[PDB]
Amino acid sequence: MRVVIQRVKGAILSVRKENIGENEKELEIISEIKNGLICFLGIHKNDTWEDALYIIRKCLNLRLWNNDNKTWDKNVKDLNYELLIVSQFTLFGNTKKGNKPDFHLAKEPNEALIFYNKIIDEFKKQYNDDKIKIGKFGNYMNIDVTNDGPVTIYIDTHDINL
Amino acid sequence: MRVVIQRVKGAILSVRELEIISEIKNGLICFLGIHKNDTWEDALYIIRKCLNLRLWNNDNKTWDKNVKDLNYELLIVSQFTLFGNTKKGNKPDFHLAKEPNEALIFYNKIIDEFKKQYNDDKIKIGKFGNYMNIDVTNDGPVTIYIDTHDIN
């Protein structure tokens, strides 16, 4: 599994919404957080539950907020902050050969959805049902993010021995 | 070198009462991490990939158009935290990251090469080594990661 974690003062996620209908075609906000993390999550085809757990553990526990003259001190749970988890297959975009990304390492959308939903449940079980927002899996999204720092963290779980 | 590329409809960068100092419409924001043992070859790979990755649909085709074809912009932000090791604790430690003073020179060389390889007016930057607030409109999203240490 791969994840890119961004520290944020807020994030607003929107998808396309077509009233077919009333011939209305606009963006509508379906998810929103204030301070916290946005995590772009890429799932590898050979990912196991252990990979998910490491990611969840790291996202929930990384001390990324300063605190009273102490830096890199507080985690997203401590400050009672939120997480926005977006599935992001492009993180398994191989750009090593040619300038068209190739996504053969990506888990296929269907198995991915089940896995992803398992992850979201675990996030909630390990933190709080109300602190975890998500996007619209497999749909085009517009995400207004306020990067606070910025602080960007990258983790590839296939780097660790689990 | 490590880079995270985000596809965007726009980005607004401010620095500390904040003031906006950089702004782009459609294009890419690129968070750039420089490794202590990085060479000019690593920079070139990153620059070439950023300018040439076909990340836009030109319709009926996918992954078809790149950032130059569309006359789009790039916002390059140095981002040492990309070398935050988190393998051994919950507190990132950043020793793979290049020392600040050498990093700045290197980083400025990169920005020049970006301009030389594209266009002086299409390349925006942040305030190196300063706290920044960046409002980004992610378009997709489309997130690309590259570690030039994976390549020879």
UniProtKB/Swiss-Prot annotation, chain B:
A motif (Gly-cisPro motif, allows the protein to recognize chirality of D-amino acids) lies at residues 140-141. InterPro entries: Daa-tRNA_deacyls_DTD, DTD-like_sf. GO terms for cellular component: cytoplasm. Changing residue 81 to A/S: Wild-type deacylation of D-tyrosyl-tRNA(Tyr). The active site is at residue 81. A motif (C-terminal adenosine nucleotide of tRNA) lies at residues 95-98. It is found in: Cytoplasm. It comes from the Eukaryota. One of its GO terms (molecular function) is Gly-tRNA(Ala) deacylase activity. Its EC number is 3.1.1.96. Coiled coil: none annotated. In the crystal structures with bound ADP (PDB 3KO4, 3KO5), the adenosine moiety is thought to represent the authentic C-terminal adenosine of charged tRNA and is annotated as such in this entry. Belongs to the DTD family. A Gly-cisPro motif from one monomer fits into the active site of the other monomer to allow specific chiral rejection of L-amino acids. Homodimer. This is D-aminoacyl-tRNA deacylase.
